[PDB]
Structures are given as C-alpha cells and as structure tokens.
Write a protein that binds this DNA or RNA. Structure first.
Ligand SMILES: [K+]
Ligand SMILES: [K+]
Ligand SMILES: [K+]
Ligand SMILES: [K+]
Ligand SMILES: [K+]
Ligand SMILES: [K+]
Ligand SMILES: [K+]
Ligand SMILES: [K+]
Ligand SMILES: [K+]
Ligand SMILES: [K+]
Ligand SMILES: [K+]
Ligand SMILES: [Mg+2]
Ligand SMILES: [Mg+2]
Ligand SMILES: [Mg+2]
Ligand SMILES: [Mg+2]
Ligand SMILES: [Mg+2]
Ligand SMILES: [Mg+2]
Ligand SMILES: [Mg+2]
Ligand SMILES: [Mg+2]
Ligand SMILES: [Mg+2]
Ligand SMILES: [Mg+2]
Ligand SMILES: [Mg+2]
Ligand SMILES: [Mg+2]
Ligand SMILES: [Mg+2]
Ligand SMILES: [Mg+2]
Ligand SMILES: [Mg+2]
Ligand SMILES: [Mg+2]
Ligand SMILES: [Mg+2]
Ligand SMILES: [Mg+2]
Ligand SMILES: [Mg+2]
Ligand SMILES: [Mg+2]
Ligand SMILES: [Mg+2]
Ligand SMILES: [Mg+2]
Ligand SMILES: [Mg+2]
Ligand SMILES: [Mg+2]
Ligand SMILES: [Mg+2]
Ligand SMILES: [Mg+2]
Ligand SMILES: [Mg+2]
Ligand SMILES: [Mg+2]
Ligand SMILES: [Mg+2]
Ligand SMILES: [Mg+2]
Lengths: 200, 154, 79, 129, 114
RNA sequence: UAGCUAGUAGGUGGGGUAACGGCUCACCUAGGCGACGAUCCCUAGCUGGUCUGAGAGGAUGACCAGCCACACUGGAACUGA
RNA sequence: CCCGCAGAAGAAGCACCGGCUAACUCCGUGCCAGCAGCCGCGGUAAUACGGAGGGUGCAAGCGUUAAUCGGAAUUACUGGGCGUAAAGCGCACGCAGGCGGUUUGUUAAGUCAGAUGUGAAAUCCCCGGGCUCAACCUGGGAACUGCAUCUGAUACUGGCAA
RNA sequence: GUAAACGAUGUCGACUUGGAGGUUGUGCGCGUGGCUUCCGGAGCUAACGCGUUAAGUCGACCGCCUGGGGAGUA
C-alpha cells in the first residue's frame, strides 16, 4: 500500500522533477534527471499515444504516492462533480491533507510527512482527508522537539510557499482559504490526457 | 501549424525481379483555431513519405467554424466505407474520439467533442469523413444569412 | 361519470349473454408503430336486446357466471 | 400508389433544390399549404401560391443564397407506415436549434420552437435545415 | 426490414458446464503432433470428467507425472495447434504436480516459491 | 405443436360458501376458446431492483425488502378469527 | 478510544516486457524442449521457449479459468443490408393484414394539454448530516420515464355523414 | 414443380440535366403518346459500374440475409 522503493527513478522515468527529494543538494548532482532508469536508459524510443497518456497519469500519481485504486476513485469523483473534470481531479488531489503537512513544511518529503502522520483543532491521521475552504490545519505540541520538523521547515523556507494558504511560525498553523484554480497549479500537467485515459 | 502523423503503411508492387516495397504516410496539419488539412505522401523511404504528406497537408487546408473549441451542432461525415458522428461537448470533456478522428480534431482546435466512427475505420477514409463532417458544419450566422433572419431569430 | 367501455357485438348466440370486442389502438413498445389490439369480454344482456354488429356501452359488475363480469349499459348503434 | 403526399412535397423540394429549379409545382392541399406557410415564415422558401379551384396547384419559389440551396436537408419524420408524436418536453431540436421541426399541434402546424413556447406537443411532420 | 415485418417477426468450453474448473480421471495419456506449420510432441490426455463428458486436455510446462487413472483439475483454454483440444490441466492441483525447476510465472505452473 | 372444449359456454331452479361464481347438482339452450397463437411441448418462482450500456437495449432476480409457493412423498380433513 | 514501554524492530508479493500493449539485454536450447488471447514464435547469434540481469504494471494482493454486458451499427427501435460480397419467391392472382387522393361537417378513438389519485421502503442520483477519513450509516429532495381517472384542445391519423 | 427459371436487380406511385437510335400510334418540316436499345451528366457505389426503363431522390407493402464449412444435409 506504499511505494517504498528508490524515489529518483520515478522522476527519471517521468523525465521531470516531481519534487520527491528533500533538497540537501541538487537533483542533477543526485541523479541523471535527463536519463530514464535502467540498463536501456540512455535509449528513448517513440512512445505511443497510449504510452503518453499513461506517463501523464503516472506523473500525477507518483508525486503524491497515490496508488492506482485510490487514484481511479479520485477520477470517478472528479467526473461526478459539476464542471471541468480534469480541473476537479487536480482540485481533489490538492485538497488532500497529506500534501499539506509536506507543503506547510513539517516533512522533508511527502514520505517523511506521511511517517509524521490537526484540522479545525481536531486530530486527523488520514493522508486522504479532503481539507475544505476556511479550515485551519495545524501541528501538535507533543512532537515539536523532533529535529526532522526543524530541518524540514528550513527546506520549506527556500521553496515558493503556496499562494492560497497561510503557513505560520511557532504554533505552526494555516488556513485552507479556498480551493486552487487551474491557474494556481503548474501549466505542465496535461490533465486532459488523464481524463482521456480513463474514458478509454 | 501543429502537425500530426496518423499512420505509416508499407505497401508493395510486384515486378519481374520480385517485390518493390514503399511507404505511405497520412498526416494532418492545423492552426488549432478552425483550420485543418490532411496530406497523403508516398516514397521509398519513411521520412520522405512523411515530408511529402506534410507538404500536401499545408496546401489543402479548409476552414471550420468552431464554437469555444467545440462543434456548432451534431454532424455526420461519410467517405468510402467510413461513417463518422461528432457531437458538441461541455468544457473538460476532452476529445472523446478514436485516434484518426482525434488527430484531426486536435489540430483543428476542437478541444471538447464526443465522436464515434462507424463502418470502416481505415485511417485514410476516416480522416476524409471527419474533415467532410467539419467543413459542412454551419454556424448560426451563415444560417441566419441564408434564411434572411437575425441570429436572435435563429 | 361512471366507468364504461364501448365495443362491437361479435356473438349473440348465448341466452342473456353477448361477446363484445373492445378495439384499442396502442403504440408498439419497441418499434413505435400504432397497432390494433382486441379484448373480447363476455357481457350480460338480460333482455337479449343486442345483435351481431351493434355498438354497445358496457360496465364492469360482480361475477354473473364463470366468464361474465360485465353488463350491458346501452346500445349506441344497431346494425 | 401515392400514399404520402407530404413526403412527395418534401421530395419535390429536395429534388428541385438539387436541380437548381427556380420553382416547384405540385397538387395542393390544406396541409401542404400549412407546411408551405411555415417554410416561408422561417425563410427556407421565398414564396408560395395556390392556383386553381377544382384541381388547385401549389407552386413553391425556392431560394438560393451564395449559389448553394438554402434547404440543405429536408426529411419526412412521421410517415403513414410509422406515425411519430411527441409531448412538449420531448419535441426534437434540429441541428442544435439552427434547423426546424415542423409540428402539427391542436393549434395548427408550427415550428418546434413555437410549439414549445405554446406548451403543445404534436405530430412531427418533418425536419428542415 | 420494415417496421411491420419486425412487428410480425422481431429481431468453446462446453464440458466445464459454466464452472471455472472440473475434476476428471485420465483415460489415456499420450503425445500428438501439432498441425502445420508446427512440429513437436505435445503432451495431451483424454479425461473423463465428474459430469461424464470425455475431453482431451493439454498438459503444459516442461515434464509431467500423469498416468491412466490420474485425477486432475482442468480449466478452459484451447491449444491453437491441436484441433479439438479445448482444455488445459491445472499444474500443482490434486495429483498433477508442479513443473520441476520453474522460476518465472511460477503461479501458472503450480510451483512453490524457492 | 392448429385446432381445443361436455360442467364444456350460457340460462333457469335447488343446494353450497364469509362472500360473487358451473362452486355443485338437475333440467334447458348449443354454445365457449383459437393465427391478436387456443391446445400441446420445453424452460422458469414474480417484483422492487442488480450488472452492463452514452442511451435505446442486453443480461439477470444471490444478499436486502414486497408478493407467491412449498415443509420426507401422495392424499385428507379437524381445531381455529 | 486514550496514555505509557521497547526497538527498525514482527510484516512484499504477483503478473508481465515480439505486435496489439506500458517495459530489452545476455546466457542455455536448436521445428527439440517448449510458448500462444489473436497474428504467430522455436530447424545455431530467439527482445516470443527456459534461466539470469535490468525494466514495466498492479500491490496485500496478483495472476489464471468461468460467467454477463461492452466494444459488436455483428439482429441495426434509436441504428444495417439484398446487381457482382450472405440476401428479390420462377411468375402471377388474391383472402386476412399493413397502407390510403381531395373538400366540408361531425366525433374525439389515436394524439396533445392540464389537474387529481397512485407509482411501498431500500437502491440509483442531488444537496446536506454522522463515524478521525473512506467504505459504511443517515436527513430532505429529485427521480420512479408508468398506470388510471377527470376536464379541455382538434392540426394530424382513425370513426361517421355528405 | 425444378433451371445461371438472370437484368443474378420484388411490386406500385411521385420527383430529378442531356445525346443518338429502333418500333408502334396520333395532331398541325414541326409537335404529342406507348414500348424498347445504346451512350453519358448530377447523384449514388467498395469498386466495377448504375444513371428518367436508376443501382439517383422519396413514400407503401411484401420476400429475403446475418462468417466459411457441416448443409439446403439429418
Ligand atoms: K513452426
Ligand atoms: K365447472
Ligand atoms: K346457474
Ligand atoms: K428487468
Ligand atoms: K408437496
Ligand atoms: K384463536
Ligand atoms: K433499422
Ligand atoms: K378528425
Ligand atoms: K477505381
Ligand atoms: K412479396
Ligand atoms: K460455424
Ligand atoms: Mg487496499
Ligand atoms: Mg489525392
Ligand atoms: Mg466492418
Ligand atoms: Mg343459481
Ligand atoms: Mg369465477
Ligand atoms: Mg424450478
Ligand atoms: Mg452501444
Ligand atoms: Mg428469491
Ligand atoms: Mg425475467
Ligand atoms: Mg372451523
Ligand atoms: Mg511498447
Ligand atoms: Mg541464442
Ligand atoms: Mg470472457
Ligand atoms: Mg448491439
Ligand atoms: Mg452489413
Ligand atoms: Mg458467387
Ligand atoms: Mg450472392
Ligand atoms: Mg425476379
Ligand atoms: Mg399483385
Ligand atoms: Mg387520407
Ligand atoms: Mg382521446
Ligand atoms: Mg421508492
Ligand atoms: Mg377526418
Ligand atoms: Mg431455386
Ligand atoms: Mg430464360
Ligand atoms: Mg437473358
Ligand atoms: Mg434468383
Ligand atoms: Mg413487352
Ligand atoms: Mg450509362
Ligand atoms: Mg432435401
């Protein structure tokens, strides 16, 4: 139920930074981001229309560590909800709480943030929890002596912190103010390929 | 212009000595804004065939009256054994079409559409059926024009 | 009103009884064509008023025999 | 034998337009005139006229825009072998609203739009675009 | 067809009996030659099933342990190059042994994990 | 599978039932059903629904709920609202 | 359900990698052994057999078989065909049946409109609510495309009359 | 009671550019009917071709098809 394997290979297979590393040093110095993994790695054949649609879906999955069954259920939810399905799907993935622990800067990676796993002042230890507009997300007091969370925040303080949220120091809390639009997120995900892949 | 290679096929003619293999390339080109053409090229080598196809495609482009990257109304297209149906769709639907129809609709600038190919799905004829369907699609303005009415009356 | 059907007498051979064909015109469930359908009812006719071909109003009543649960109301048209 | 005069009228129009005829003539009837009135008002034909008394003949003046015929398609829907009636909510849209369906309602022959605004269903005579 | 005509008149593994497997007893065990263009000694067996049907079944993998009066589980699956062979024997079920010294696709040949 | 039917179809009267009724019996009439498929043969519990499908359909009726039927097999009544 | 203890400790597999189809090499074998859903693969340099290394897909599951619908517009009502691909009876007359030129009147069966009654609850769907989340449970709605009755409309179809 | 019984093309009706013939009526070189043959236009068709005697555009009704075999067999 978790991918517990070498993490750089995913970014290598996708051929893009998926933000899967802590950032103690550069991605180029860590691995060959240009090259796909394995013995036949410097090779790069033509990929089919199917193969392209697959790799876009596997991109959006492998960032978050969402396995296929759970990802499929998000697609179904996104298609069900009113309006644009591809946008609804990204909104649902962005609405997840386990993004937030990482994104607010408590884990160095999402894998670390997931090891570390309060919303509206109530404890929630579920990665898949959909955080709503106007909800305050925050940390406990009992585990603020961990060096992990200290280091992770210093890693977080070099990134561009998200632009629909409000992370705070000390008591360490922030409001999910609104759901992100597609404008907020990377114009790089071609989510129509995922919509098309599941329509197949 | 966006350019897409739909199909490459190895064809053969027999001669005294034996068989002479050659390649055919079916391509579509479009501006992503209601202009699209297809090209069919033949050559002894694959890259020459594609180049010939792309040159043909650029000069044989037709205009399609789009609406918001979808169609004006349901359209039927026919060519040879290929019969295609295409319908306007809502935003976020994507191109719900088979590969040959998808390539045409994508370069034409149709983002949202529901399609189905009946009869033969031979790419060469599906592309002709699709472009045939698109080029005879009416906008409200030309309907208003031909009927001698205003668009609000239509 | 009280509920009635109208139909054509197709037999008057029984004593105090007639057979009435009710014709109905119904859309075919699959193919959509409108089709003629017939329901034959055994009807009570105390006086033996009716004859083969008459149009009759009939009403539902209590069972009067094995096959009869309808009675004659009027003759609409004599044949 | 001749068993659908309305299909015949539609065909005379269809074939007239394909042959670039200025007008088409046919044996008249009250229903043909009612349909001709709808085609005129919606701007598919230019004009019509009935001539005669014992044997009246309906003439339809066809219209062309930029060379092309204006009636691009005209198809019988309800026909003697299969009558088609629709409730007000199930009235057909022809060409996503850009065409018309001619509907016989209890308030006379009219377009699908006019039927829908009047709150009437009826028999679907034909689709025109 | 016209509407009136339609109104008048509207529009491979039989021995399993829609079961996923059936048990059977081997009545003969032999080899047979495939049809063209193939060449091999393909290991088959005639099997009388618990429902009384007698069928030819294929024995897959490298080397088998089946005699006459061996009790096997068959599943669906024709062998393309043996006409009239419509069933496969399940390896590692009942009497039929697992394939000796298999390491890939082990679950298809009834071979426990080394 | 093209003909089927003699309490068979209807009537009158007696009896019977909680109750209408060939429900039953006597007498009278000769009806009644059937190509809009009677009769005969084969398969089957029915439905809300379920699966699939863009829909129209197709397949299906396990679990849950409504209805029916059965209680070793065949038959019978008694008691009792 | 909460708090405390100890220590990464007690916990990863299955299928696949010739095309269709995401993923390729070496070694063994030499039309054999074997593979195979379909096309096919194997007769000495096999990405197709068997092992290995690498890889892809799923993951407490993964594969296989069985079974239904889909794709299949391949029974086509929506939505197909019949000169030569399967398909026009050898030809006609004709009962039942289907269909029916044109005008007026009438009727209101079809058709259409409105109303009323019914269409169990659950399920599906929508907006909410509750279990940390989810599944699951649940409030209200929508839906149940139907059926019946009553009151109207009368163009079209049917009946009747001329 | 069957044939490659063939136009391998069901019957009836309406509509839709032309050209050249044959045959058989009829009105004043010029019309107007019936039947028939060849070529070809749009359109249609997988193509071949069909093309006012449609395989074009429509309507009514019937007959028939549903992979090759097994079999027009039991
Ligand atoms: K071979
Ligand atoms: K009896
Ligand atoms: K009696
Ligand atoms: K059902
Ligand atoms: K019993
Ligand atoms: K009691
Ligand atoms: K059809
Ligand atoms: K009337
Ligand atoms: K050609
Ligand atoms: K016939
Ligand atoms: K067969
Ligand atoms: Mg799980
Ligand atoms: Mg060309
Ligand atoms: Mg096909
Ligand atoms: Mg009595
Ligand atoms: Mg009774
Ligand atoms: Mg049973
Ligand atoms: Mg479908
Ligand atoms: Mg049951
Ligand atoms: Mg059933
Ligand atoms: Mg008692
Ligand atoms: Mg590949
Ligand atoms: Mg080798
Ligand atoms: Mg299956
Ligand atoms: Mg189907
Ligand atoms: Mg076909
Ligand atoms: Mg032949
Ligand atoms: Mg043939
Ligand atoms: Mg013939
Ligand atoms: Mg005849
Ligand atoms: Mg009439
Ligand atoms: Mg009425
Ligand atoms: Mg309910
Ligand atoms: Mg009338
Ligand atoms: Mg014959
Ligand atoms: Mg002859
Ligand atoms: Mg001849
Ligand atoms: Mg023949
Ligand atoms: Mg002759
Ligand atoms: Mg010709
Ligand atoms: Mg015979």
């Amino acid at each position: 139920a978790r991918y517990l394997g070498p993490k750089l290979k995913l970014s290598r297979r996708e051929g893009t930074d998926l933000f899967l590393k802590s950032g103690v040093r550069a991605i180029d110095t860590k691995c060959k981001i240009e090259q796909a993994p394995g013995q036949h790695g410097a090779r790069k054949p033509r990929l089919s229309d199917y193969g392209v649609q697959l790799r876009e879906k596997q991109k959006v999955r492998r960032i978050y560590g969402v396995l296929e069954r759970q990802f499929r259920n998000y697609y179904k939810e996104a298609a069900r909800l009113k309006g644009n399905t591809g946008e609804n799907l990204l909104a649902l993935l962005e609405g997840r709480l386990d993004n937030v622990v990482y994104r607010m800067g408590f884990g160095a990676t999402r894998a670390e943030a997931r090891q570390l796993v309060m919303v509206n002042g109530r404890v929630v230890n579920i990665a898949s929890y959909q955080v709503s507009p106007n909800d305050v997300v925050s940390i406990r007091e009992k585990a603020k002596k961990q060096s992990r969370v200290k280091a992770a925040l210093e890693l977080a303080e070099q990134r561009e912190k998200p632009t629909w949220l409000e992370v705070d120091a000390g008591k360490m809390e922030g409001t999910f103010k609104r759901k992100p639009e597609r404008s907020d997120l990377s114009a790089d995900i071609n989510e129509h390929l995922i919509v098309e892949l599941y329509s197949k | 212009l966006q350019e897409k290679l739909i199909a490459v096929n190895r064809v053969s003619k027999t001669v005294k000595g034996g068989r002479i293999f050659s390649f055919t390339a079916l391509t579509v080109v479009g501006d992503g804004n209601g202009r699209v053409g297809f090209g069919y090229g033949k050559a002894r080598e694959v890259p020459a065939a594609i180049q010939k196809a792309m040159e043909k495609a650029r000069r044989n482009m037709i205009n399609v009256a789009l609406n918001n990257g979808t169609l004006q109304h349901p359209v039927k297209g026919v060519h040879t054994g290929s019969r295609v149906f295409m319908q306007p769709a809502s935003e976020g639907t994507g191109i719900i079409a088979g590969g040959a129809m998808r390539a045409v609709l994508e370069v034409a600038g149709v983002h949202n559409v529901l399609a189905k190919a009946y009869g033969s799905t031979n790419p060469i004829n599906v592309v002709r059926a699709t472009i045939d369907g698109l080029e005879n699609m009416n906008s409200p303005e030309m309907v208003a024009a031909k009927r001698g009415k205003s668009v609000e009356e239509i | 009103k009280i509920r009635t059907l109208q139909g054509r007498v197709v037999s008057d051979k029984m004593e105090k009884s007639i057979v009435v064909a009710i014709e109905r015109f119904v859309k075919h469930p699959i193919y959509g064509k409108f089709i003629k359908r017939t329901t034959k009812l055994h009807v009570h006719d105390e006086n033996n008023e009716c004859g083969i071909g008459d149009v009759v109003e009939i009403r539902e009543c209590r069972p009067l025999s094995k096959t009869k649960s309808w009675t004659l109301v009027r003759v609409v048209e004599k044949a | 034998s001749m068993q659908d005069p309305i299909a015949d009228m539609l065909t005379r129009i269809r074939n007239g337009q394909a042959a670039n005829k200025a007008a088409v003539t046919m044996p008249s009837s009250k229903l043909k005139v009612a349909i001709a009135n709808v085609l005129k008002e919606e701007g598919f034909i230019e004009d019509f006229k009935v001539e005669g008394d014992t044997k009246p003949e309906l003439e339809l003046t066809l219209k062309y825009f930029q060379g092309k015929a204006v009636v691009e398609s005209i198809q019988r829907v309800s026909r003697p072998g299969l009558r088609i009636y629709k409730r007000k909510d199930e009235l057909p849209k022809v060409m996503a609203g850009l065409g018309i369906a001619v509907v016989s309602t209890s308030k006379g022959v009219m377009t699908d739009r006019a039927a829908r605004q009047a709150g009437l269903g009826g028999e679907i005579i034909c689709y025109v675009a | 067809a016209t509407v009136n005509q339609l109104v008048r008149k509207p529009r491979n593994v039989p021995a399993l009996e829609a079961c996923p497997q059936k048990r059977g007893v081997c009545t003969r065990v032999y080899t047979t030659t495939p049809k063209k263009p193939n060449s091999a000694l393909r290991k088959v067996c005639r099997v009388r099933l618990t429902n009384g049907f007698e069928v030819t079944s294929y024995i897959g993998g490298e080397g088998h342990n089946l005699q006459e009066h061996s009790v096997i589980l068959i599943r669906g699956g024709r062998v393309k190059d043996l006409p009239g062979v419509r069933y496969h024997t399940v390896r590692g079920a009942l009497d039929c042994s697992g394939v000796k010294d298999r390491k890939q696709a082990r679950s298809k040949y009834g071979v426990k994990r080394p």
